[PDB]
Amino acid sequence: SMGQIPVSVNYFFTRKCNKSCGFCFHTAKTSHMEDISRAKRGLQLLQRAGMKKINFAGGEPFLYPKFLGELVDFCKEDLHLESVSIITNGSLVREEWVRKHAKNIDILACSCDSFDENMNIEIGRGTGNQVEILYRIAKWCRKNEIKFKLNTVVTRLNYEEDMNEHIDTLQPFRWKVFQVLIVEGENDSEKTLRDARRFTISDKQFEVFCSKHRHHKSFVAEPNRLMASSYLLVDEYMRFIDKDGNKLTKSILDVGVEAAMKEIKWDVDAFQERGGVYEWTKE
C-alpha cells in the first residue's frame, strides 16, 4: 500500500473574514489560529511528506498580514517550496506588504465574482469599487514579479456575465472558474452560517458561462465534480478536512501527515483532470 503524496496543499489558517459572501464554503466557525511555532511545524511536516506547493486560504488571510508574511517567508526561504500562493478577497492587501514579501510569493490570487457593483452587493461581496482594487493588486503583482491569478465563482445570479474585456486587460496567468459548490455543514441549509442554495446552477447554466470564456489560455473550469474531492484541505488546527464526506481528522501536529491523510478522500484523478499540477513557480 502507499499513502498519497500531498503535493499541493491549502492551509486555511483562519476562518475569520471581513466579507459576507452568501455562498461561502469556508465559514467563520471559529476564530482559533495556530501559534506561529505550531504552524511552522505543520508546514514542515507537509514539506517532509512531499508538499511542493502551499496555498494560504481561509477565511481572509490578509486579516493577519504579519502572520501570513512570516509563513510565506518561511515556506520559500526555509522549506524551499516550489510554489507559495495566496488567495484573497483583496480588500486588505497593501502595496508595501506585497513589496516586502514578493520575492517569496509565486502566485497571488484575487477573487472577483462580478465586475458589476450591484451584483457584488447582492452576493455579499460588499459595496464600493472592488474593480479598482483588483486592478491595483494586479499592478502590484506585475511591478513585483508575482504571478497574478483570478478566481471567479459562477452562481445563479452572475452566470450570464461576460468578463472577456476584463480578462483581456488583466490577463491573469490562471483564472479559476468555479461552479458554486454546496458543502455539507458549511453552506447547505438555513442553519449553517451561509445558505448557498439560492446560488446553485445546473450544468447547462455553468456551460453558458464556460462557453463564453473558455478560449482564454488562463481559463480553468471546475464544475462541482472537479471541486468535490480534488483538493487537500488543512484547517485552522492543521487537521485535514474532507468536505465531500464531512469528516475531520486529528491534527497533523499530533498524528503526522500520513495517518491524517489516510482518513480523507483526495481524488487524484480529479486533481490531475483540473490541471492541479502546473507551472506554479515564477520565471
Ligand X SMILES: C[S@@+](CC[C@H](N)C(=O)[O-])C[C@H]1O[C@@H](n2cnc3c(N)ncnc32)[C@H](O)[C@@H]1O
Give 123's Cβ-side CA count (13 Å radius): 24
Footprint on residues 35-94 left by ligand SF4 (CB under 6 A) = 58-60, 89
Output 147 or 213, the one with its CB closest to Cl ion: 147
Active site (annotated) includes residue 24: yes
The sign of the torsion formed by the CA atoms of 241, 219, 151, 40 equals positive
- By a kind-dependent CB cut-off of 5 to 8 A, residue 180 interacts, out of ligand CTP, ligand X, ligand SF4, none, with ligand X
- By a kind-dependent CB cut-off of 5 to 8 A, residue 57 interacts, out of ligand SF4, ligand CTP, Cl ion, none, with ligand CTP
To ligand CTP, the closest distance from the beta carbon of 272 in angstroms equals 11
- By a kind-dependent CB cut-off of 5 to 8 A, residue 8 interacts, out of ligand X, Cl ion, ligand CTP, none, with ligand CTP
Bin 90: left if φ > 0, else alpha if -120 < ψ < 50, else beta: left
> In angstroms, rounded to a whole number, what is the distance separating the alpha carbons of residues 236 and 143?
32
3-state secondary structure 238-265: CEEEECCCCEEEEEHHHHHHHHHHCCCC
Assess 240 for contact with Cl ion (CB under 5 A).
Answer: no
Task: Please report which helix (H) or strand (E) contains residue 147, including its range.
Answer: strand 147-154
To ligand SF4, the closest distance from the beta carbon of 48 in angstroms equals 29
Assess 19 for contact with ligand SF4 (CB under 6 A).
Answer: yes
- By a kind-dependent CB cut-off of 5 to 8 A, residue 24 interacts, out of ligand CTP, Cl ion, ligand SF4, none, with ligand SF4
Task: Count other C-beta atoms under 10 Å from residue 7's C-beta.
Answer: 18
Active site (annotated) includes residue 21: yes
Cβ contacts of residue 198 below 8 Å, gap of 6+?
Answer: 22, 156
Output 49 or 237, the one with its CB closest to ligand X: 237
Chain position carrying cell 459562477? 154
Residues that bind Cl ion (CB under 5 A): 147-148, 173
| Enzyme catalytic residues | 17, 21, 24
